[PDB]
Amino acid sequence: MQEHYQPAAIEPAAQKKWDDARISNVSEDASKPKYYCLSMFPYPSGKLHMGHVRNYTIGDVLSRFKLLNGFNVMQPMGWDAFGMPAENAAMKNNVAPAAWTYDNIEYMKTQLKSLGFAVDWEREVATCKPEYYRWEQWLFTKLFEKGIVYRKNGTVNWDPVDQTVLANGQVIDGRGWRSGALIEKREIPMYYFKITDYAEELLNDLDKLEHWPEQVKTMQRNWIGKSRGMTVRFAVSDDSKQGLEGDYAKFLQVYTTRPDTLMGATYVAVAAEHPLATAAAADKPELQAFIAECKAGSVAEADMATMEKKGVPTGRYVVNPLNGDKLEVWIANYVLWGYGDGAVMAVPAHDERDFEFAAKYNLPKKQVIAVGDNAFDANRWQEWYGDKENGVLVNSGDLDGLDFQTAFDAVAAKLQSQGAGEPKTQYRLRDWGISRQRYWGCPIPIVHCEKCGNVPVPADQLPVVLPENVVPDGMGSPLAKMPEFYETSCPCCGGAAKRETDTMDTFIESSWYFFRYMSPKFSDGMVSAESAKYWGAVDQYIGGIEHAILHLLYARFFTKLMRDEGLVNVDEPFERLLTQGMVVCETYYRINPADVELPVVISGTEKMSKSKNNGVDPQELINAYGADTARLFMMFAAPPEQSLEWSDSGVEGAHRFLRRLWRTVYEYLKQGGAVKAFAGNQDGLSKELKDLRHKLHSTTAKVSDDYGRRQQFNTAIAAVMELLNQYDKTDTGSEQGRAVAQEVLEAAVRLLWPIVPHICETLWSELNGAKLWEAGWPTVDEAALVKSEIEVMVQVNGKLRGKITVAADASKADLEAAALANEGAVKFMEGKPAKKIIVVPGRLVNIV
Ligand SMILES: Nc1ncnc2c1ncn2[C@@H]1O[C@H](COP(=O)(O)OP(=O)(O)OP(=O)(O)O)[C@@H](O)[C@H]1O
Ligand SMILES: Nc1ncnc2c1ncn2[C@@H]1O[C@H](COP(=O)(O)OP(=O)(O)OP(=O)(O)O)[C@@H](O)[C@H]1O
Ligand SMILES: CC(C)C[C@H](N)CO
Ligand SMILES: [Mg+2]
Ligand SMILES: [Zn+2]
C-alpha cells in the first residue's frame, strides 16, 4: 500500500473497477428488492456547478447505502434537453440548438463520470432525441381523441417589433424586454391538457404521501385551490335592466365561499367585461375609461395582490335574495372575468379586501359574525372578523347563532328552495396550456386539413421529427417558415395539409421521464409493462424546491394519465421527496471567483448560478483536490436541506480528513498487516477495547439511522469522525487489539463508502479480500452495546445489610426496588416501612 493519498490516481482506478463489475448496470432482477433513487435530471446548459454536485452526491449517497444493504438500485441520469437556453445560445453563436445541446451533454457526462456516481449509464436518455419524445407525441394523440387534450383560443403576448410571442416574464411594464414596444393581447388557437378534470384526484391523493414534506403538499393544495362555496343569484332590479339580455337581464350570479355572511352583503362588484359593466357604461364615459384601464393590465396574481383595488359605481342595482336589500353594482379591477361568474358580492365586515375597498369609498359595513365577546369596530380591521371557525352569526334572522357550517347548509337549502342559488365547488387550477411558439421543442402531432380540421398524426407515423438543421434567429419560429416541414398530406383524406408548427411545453418531457428510465429502449410504448411492474414508483426523489409545484403537479398528472391508459399501475410517481438546500457563493462583477484573487466589485454571498457567474466549476475542484474531497465537503458542510456556503476552508478540511483516513489505514497495516476482524463474544476483552467496540457499534447504528431514516449526512460523517477519535486514543497493538482495530477500520470504510466511495473502495481492498458490496452494510452487534453491571451496597439506617447487582442503566426506582428486595435489608427492616430511601447511584442505597 502506498503511504500517501493520491486521489488523482485511485479515483479513475476505482471507477474502472465499478464499471467493469457493472454494479450500477441493473435489470428487472426479481431475485433482489428494487430501489429507485432519482435525482432531477439537468438542463444541458454546458457545465455543471457545485449545486448540481450537491444534488447528485446526495442521490448517490442514498443509492450506495441501499446498494450495500442488498437492494437492486436503479439510479438513472439523463438530459432535459429541450428549451430556450439552446435557442438563445443558437442565435448568439449561430449554431444549431441540437449541436450546442449534444456538445454540452458530452462535457457534462464526463464531469458526472469523474465524480463517480453509481449511475446506470445504459439507461441514459436525452429528451431532444426522437426515440424519447415520440412517446409524449403518442400520448398527446391518445388524449386528444378522448378530449383530455383539446384545442381552443387563448391569449398570448404578441410583440409587434420582434414578431414573436413572449412570456409574462419577458414583458416589463407592458413592453417587450428586447424591443420596448407595447405588447398586444392576441387570441390564438392553442392546445390544452384538461388537468381540471383531475383536480380532485390531484388534491386528494396528496394524503397518500405520508413521506413528503408537509410544505410541499401545502403548496400543491394552494395551487389547485379547491373551495367549497355557494353560487348566489341576485335578481336584477326592475329599474336596472336597460341593455341587458338573456339571464344577465334577470339575475346577477356570483360565487362566494362565505355564504354565511350573505346577510352582511352591502354592495356587489363585477368585472369590467361583465355585461352589467358594458350596459351601464354605454352612456357614461367615466365607466368606459375605467373599463379600458382594467383591460389595460395583466391578471397576474403577482401584480394583483399588490394592485391598488379600485372601482366605480354603476347606478344599477340587484336584490339580495335572503333579506331583500337592493345593492348597487360596482365595476372593480379586482374581479377577474373567466374565474367563476365574473362577479362577486362584498361583505366588508368580514373580508379584508372588501373592508379596505369599502373604507376607501365609504360603503356600508354590516356585522353578521361575532367571535365571543370581541368588540366589532366598523373603522378598523381585526383578524377575528374573518374567523371561519370560532364565530356565530348575528343580524341574520333565521340564521342567528349558527356556526359556519350550520349557516352554510342552512343558506344552501334556503337558496335552493327559492331557486336563487346552490352549492358549488370551484378551483383556482386552470387547464394546462402546452403550445409554445418556439422551435427547440417537441413538435405537436397535429395536421391541419381544410376539410378534416385538426387531425392527430397516426401512431405509425410518429414521431413527427423535429428538423435539427435549424439556426433560429429570434423573429419567429423557423418551423413556420419551413414549408418542407409544415407542408404534408392529411392522414384522413390524403389532401394537401399543414403540420402544426408550435412545439410543446418542455415541462412535458420532465412529466414522465422517470418511467422512461424503466425501459428507455422500449419501442412499443412509453414504458414496457414488465419493467413498470418491477420498478413500481420512484422510491426517492431529490431536487430543489423551485420545482416543487408545477413540475411535481405535472408529473403526478401524467402518472394518473398513464395509469388510466394502462401503462402503469401506481397512483403517485414519487414516494419520498428530498429538497436540497441551495449552494451559495460570494459574487464579483464589473465574473467567476476562480478567475479572481483575494480589481473588480466585491459583493456579498448569494446562490450559485450562471446569472452572476458565481458558480464554482467542479472540474477545477476535482483537478485540485479530487472527487471524494468534493463529495465530502458538500455532505459535511451542512444538513442537505440547509443552504451551503462555498468555502476554501471547508474544502481543505475535507481533504485533510481523507488524508487522515488514508494515513490511519496505512499506519495500521504497516504494524502487522491485515488480520481477521474481531467477532463474537467479547467477554475477556479489556475495558478499553470493549469501549471501542461500544463506540463502533453505536456509530454503526447512528450512521444507519442518519442515512436511512433522517437523511442527515453531515452528522453521519461526524459520528465516524468520533469513532476514529476514540480509535486514535486506544491501544490496539495486542492480538485482540489488532482484531478490534481491523473491525473498526472495516466498518469505518464501509460506513463512509456512500459519501467517498473512491478512497473507501481502495482502503477496503487493502484491509479485506472480499468484494465490498458482497460484505455489505455493517451490522450492529447488540452485545457490544451492553455495559458491565454495578454492585450496589444496601444499607438499613446506615448499617450495611446486603448487596445488590444492578444494571449500569438502572434507574433510581430499580435501585430502590432491588434494595427493598434484598434479604439482608428485609431482615433488618423488622416489617416496618421506610420514611425515605436515599439512593446514591453506583455507590449505595440507604433505606430509612
Ligand atoms: N372571479 C373572482 N375574482 C375575484 N374574487 C373572487 C372571484 N370569485 C370569487 N371571489 C371572491 O373570493 C372569495 C374567496 O375565494 P378564493 O378562491 O380566494 O377561496 P379561498 O382562498 O379558499 O377562501 P377563504 O378566503 O374564505 O379561505 C369569495 O368569497 C369571493 O368573495
Ligand atoms: N445552487 C444550487 N444549490 C443546490 N442545488 C442546486 C443549485 N442549482 C441547482 N440545483 C439543483 O440541481 C438540479 C438541476 O438544477 P438546474 O440548474 O438544471 O435548474 P434550476 O434550479 O431551474 O436553474 P437555476 O439555477 O438557473 O434557477 C435541481 O434539482 C436544482 O434544484
Ligand atoms: C425535473 C426538471 C423540471 C428539472 C430540470 N430539468 C432542471 O432543473
Ligand atoms: Mg401508503
Ligand atoms: Zn383531410
Query: Do 18 and 26 form a contact (C-beta atoms < 8 A)?
Result: no
Q: What are phi and psi of 507, to 5 degrees?
A: -55, -25
Query: Which residue type sits at 193?
Result: F
Helices (H) and strands (E) in the chain, counts: 27, 34
Report the distance separating Cα 357 and Cα 268, nearest Å.
Answer: 12
540, 789, 795 from 792: Cα distances, Å: 51, 10, 10
Residue written as grid cell 373604507: 359
| CA distances (Å), origin 702, targets 7, 262, 719 | 28, 59, 7
Backbone angles phi, psi at 46, to 5 degrees: 140, -60
152 C-alpha to center of ligand 5: Å? Answer: 20
Quick one: which H or E segment has residue 411?
A: helix 404-417
* Other beta carbons less than 10 A from residue 565's beta carbon: 16
Q: Measuring from atom 27 of ligand 1, which residue has the nearest CA? A: 257
Q: Measured in angstroms, how far is the CA atom of residue 765 from the centroid of ligand 1?
A: 66
Give Cα 429 distance to the centre of its chain. 19
Q: Is 452 left (phi over 0), alpha (psi -120 to 50) or beta?
A: alpha
Buried b (16+ CB within 10 A) or exposed e, 790-799: bebbbbbeee
Whether ligand 2 lies within 6 angstroms of the CB of 758 is answered as no
- Do β-strands 175-176 and 171-172 pair in parallel, antiparallel, or remain unpaired? antiparallel
Region of 776 (left: φ > 0; alpha: ψ -120 to 50; beta: rest) is left
The DSSP 8-state label assigned to residue 124 in this structure reads: -
CB atoms closer than 10 angstroms to residue 217: 17
Q: Which segments within 428-470 are labelled E, that is strand?
A: 432-433, 435-436, 446-449, 453-456
| Cβ–Cβ < 8 Å for 546, 160 | no
Calculate the dihedral angle through the C-alpha atoms of 190, 194, 195, 201, rounding to the nearest 10 degrees. Answer: 180
DSSP summary character for residue 182: B
Q: Residue 184: enclosing H or E segment and its boundaries?
A: strand 184-193
φ and ψ at residue 216, rounded to 5 degrees: -70, -40
Nearest CA to ligand 2 atom 23: 609
DSSP at 413: H
Q: Report how far apart, in Å, the C-alpha atoms of 695 and of each of 137, 582, 602, 689, 728 are.
A: 57, 34, 46, 10, 12
Reading the block at residue 695, the C-alpha cell is 463506540
Give Cα separations from 605 to 161, 351, 634 (angstroms): 38, 41, 17
DSSP code at position 321? T
Instruction: Determine if ligand 2 sits within 6 Å of the CB of residue 40.
Output: yes
Distance CA(408)–CA(466), nearest Å, equals 55
Q: Is 42 in the pocket of ligand 3 (CB under 6 A)?
A: yes
Element (H, E) at 229: strand 226-236
The per-residue DSSP string of 273-286 comes to TSHHHHHHTTT-HH
Question: Cα–Cα distances in Å, from 144 out to 16, 137, 141, 194, 259?
Answer: 48, 10, 5, 10, 39
- In whole angstroms, give the CA distance from residue 709 to residue 839: 38
**Angle of the 687-705 helix axis to the 713-728 helix axis, nearest 10:** 170
Q: Does ligand 3 have an atom closer than 6 angstroms to the CB of 40?
A: yes
> What is the four-CA torsion angle of 599, 601, 607, 611, rounded to 10 degrees?
-90
Grid coordinates in use for 784?
Answer: 457490544
Instruction: Work out which ligand 2 atom sits closest to the CA atom of 608.
Output: 1
* 544 CB within 6 A, ligand 2: yes
Q: How far is Cα 383 from Cα 714, in angstroms, rounded to an integer?
A: 42
Q: How far apart are CA 430 and CA 514, in angstroms?
A: 25
Q: What is the whole-number distance in angstroms between the Cα of residue 511 and the centre of ligand 3?
A: 10
The ligand that comes nearest to the alpha carbon of residue 512 is 3
* Beta carbons of 407 and 393 less than 8 angstroms apart: yes
What CA–CA distance (Å, rounded) separates 515 from 535? Answer: 9
Entry resolution (Å): 2.3
Measured in Å, residue 510 CA sits from the centre of ligand 3 at 7
Among candidate residues 787, 844, 790, the one with its CA nearest the CA of residue 816? 844
Contacts of 758 (CB under 8 A, 6+ apart): 7, 10, 11, 14, 15, 116, 626, 627, 628
Instruction: Return the ligand 1 atom nearest residue 257 CA.
Output: 29
What is the secondary structure of 648-709 as a DSSP string?
Answer: HHHHHHHHHHHHHHHHHHHHHHTTT---PPP-S--TTS-HHHHHHHHHHHHHHHHHHHIIII
- d(CA 44, CA 109) in angstroms, rounded, equals 10
Q: What's the N-to-C CA distance of the chain in angstroms?
A: 66
User: Does residue 104 contact residue 610 with C-beta atoms inside 8 Å?
Assistant: no
Instruction: At 761, list the grid cell.
Output: 473502495
Q: How many residues does the chain have?
A: 848
- In this structure, are residues 26 and 671 in contact, taking their beta carbons and an 8 Å threshold? no
Q: Kindly state if the Cβ of 82 falls inside 6 Å of ligand 3.
A: no
Q: How far apart are CA 173 and CA 294, in angstroms?
A: 15
Q: In what order do the strands lie in the sheet with 790-796?
A: 799-806, 790-796, 844-847, 837-840
Yes or no: say if 63 and 37 are a contact pair by the CB < 8 Å rule.
Answer: yes
Q: Would you state the torsion angle of the CA atoms of residues 656, 659, 661, 663, taken in this order, to the nearest 10 degrees?
A: -140
Among residues 629, 632, 700, 668, the alpha carbon closest in space to that of 766 is found at: 668
Question: Ligand 3: distance of its center to the CA of 53 in Å?
Answer: 15
Beta bridge partners of 345: 268
How many Å apart are CA 634 and CA 621, to the nearest integer?
A: 12
Residues 132, 148: Cα–Cα separation, whole Å: 22
What does the alpha-carbon distance between residue 705 and residue 497 come to, in Å, rounded to a whole number? 62
In short, whether 509's Cβ falls inside 6 Å of ligand 3 is no
Does a cis peptide bond (omega within 30 degrees of 0) precede residue 445? Answer: no
* CA–CA dist 505, 82 (Å, integer): 9
- Residue span of the structural domain in which 671 resides: 644-785
Is residue 505 within 6 Å of ligand 3 at its C-beta? no
Q: Residue 594 contacts by C-beta under 8 Å, 6 or more apart in sequence?
A: 616, 617, 620
The residue whose CA has the least distance to atom 6 of ligand 3 is 42
Distance 648 CA to ligand 2 centre (A): 21
CA 548 from centre of chain: 3
Question: Cα separations (Å) of 212 from 37, 215, 540, 542, 573?
Answer: 15, 9, 10, 11, 12
Protein residues with CB under 6 Å of any ligand 1 atom = 225, 227, 255-258, 334-336, 339-340, 344, 428
Sequence-separated (6 or more) residues with CB below 8 Å from residue 830: none
Burial 639-675 (b: 16+ CB within 10 A, else e): bbeeebebeeebbeebbebbeebbebbbebbeeeebb
Give the number of the ligand closest to the Cα of residue 571. Answer: 4
Residue 453 CA to ligand 5 centre (angstroms): 7
Kindly state the cell numbers that stand for 691.
469501549
469 close to 518: Cβ distance less than 8 angstroms: no
Breaks (C-N over 2.5 A) in the chain follow: 590, 598
Tell me how far the alpha carbon of residue 444 lies from the centroid of ligand 2, in angstroms: 28
Set of cell numbers at residue 800? 450495611
* Nearest alpha-carbon partner for 279 in 248, 301, 238, 304: 248
Q: Is 491 exposed, middle or buried (0-12, 13-18, 19+ CB in 10 A)?
A: middle
Distance of CA 778 to the CA centre of its chain: 32
Largest CA distance in the chain: 114
Q: Please tell me the distance from the alpha carbon of residue 66 to that of residue 608, in angstroms, as a whole number.
A: 30
Number of Cα atoms under 13 Å in the Cβ half of residue 442: 30
User: Which ligand 2 atom is the nearest neighbour of the CA of 582?
Assistant: 3
Q: Whose CA is nearest to atom 12 of ligand 2?
A: 52
Q: Would residue 658 be called left, alpha or beta, if left means φ above 0 and alpha means ψ between -120 and 50 degrees?
A: alpha
Residue 447's identity, in one-letter code, is: V
**Residue whose entry in the numeric block shows the C-alpha cell 435501585:** 815
Residue recorded with cell 422510491: 539
Q: CA–CA distance from 450 to each of 340, 471, 489, 495, 499 (Å)? A: 35, 30, 11, 9, 12
Per-residue exposure over 571-603, b if at least 16 CB sit within 10 Å of its own CB, e if not = ebbbbbbbbbbbbbbbbbeeeebeeeeeeeeee
Cβ distance 432 to 79 under 8 Å? Answer: no
Ligand 5 centroid to residue 451 C-alpha, Å: 5
Say how far apart CA 706 and CA 379 lie, in whole Å.
55
Instruction: Provide the H-helix boundaries in 676-798.
Output: 687-705, 713-728, 735-752, 757-767, 772-775
Q: Please tell me if the CB atom of residue 542 comes closer than 6 angstroms to any atom of ligand 2.
A: no
With a 6 A CB cut-off, is 585 part of the ligand 3 pocket?
Answer: no
Q: Which atom of ligand 2 is the closest one to the Cα of 43?
A: 18
Q: Is 550 exposed, middle or buried (0-12, 13-18, 19+ CB in 10 A)?
A: middle
Check if the beta carbon of residue 569 is closer than 8 Å to that of residue 533.
yes
Instruction: Give the SS3 label for residue 758.
Output: helix
- Whether the CB of 55 sits within 6 Å of ligand 2: yes
Out of 226, 227, 354, mutate this one to test ligand 1's pocket (max ligand atoms within 8 Å of CB): namely: 227
For residue 254, the ligand closest to its alpha carbon is 1
Q: What is the DSSP letter of 710?
A: I
**Known binding positions for ATP:** 610
The 3-state secondary structure of 585-615, one letter per residue: EEEEECCCCCCCCCCCEEEEEEECCCCCCCC
User: By alpha-carbon position, which residue is closest to atom 7 of ligand 2?
Assistant: 51
Ligand nearest to the CA of 52: 2
Q: What is the CA radius of gyration of the chain?
A: 35
Instruction: Retrieve residue 419's grid coordinates.
Output: 331557486
* Cα gap 94→98, rounded to integer Å: 12
386 C-alpha to ligand 2 centroid (Å): 39
Q: Report the C-alpha gap between 251 and 270 in whole angstroms.
A: 13
Write the burial class of residue 819 (CB in 10 Å: 0-12 exposed, 13-18 middle, 19+ buried): buried
Least distant ligand from the CA of 453: 5
CA–CA distances in Å: residue 40 to residues 16, 77, 94:
25, 9, 30
Instruction: Decide: 745 and 759 in contact? Cβ < 8 Å.
Output: no
User: Residue 204 C-alpha to ligand 4 middle, in angstroms?
Assistant: 13
Smallest CA separation from ligand 1 atom 3, residue: 335
Measure the CA–CA gap between 477 and 438, rounded to whole angstroms: 5
Q: For residue 649, give the CATH number of its domain.
A: 1.10.730.10
Asked if residues 50 and 616 have their Cβ atoms less than 8 Å apart, the reply is: yes
Q: Counting ligands in written order, which one lies closest to the CA of residue 41?
A: 3
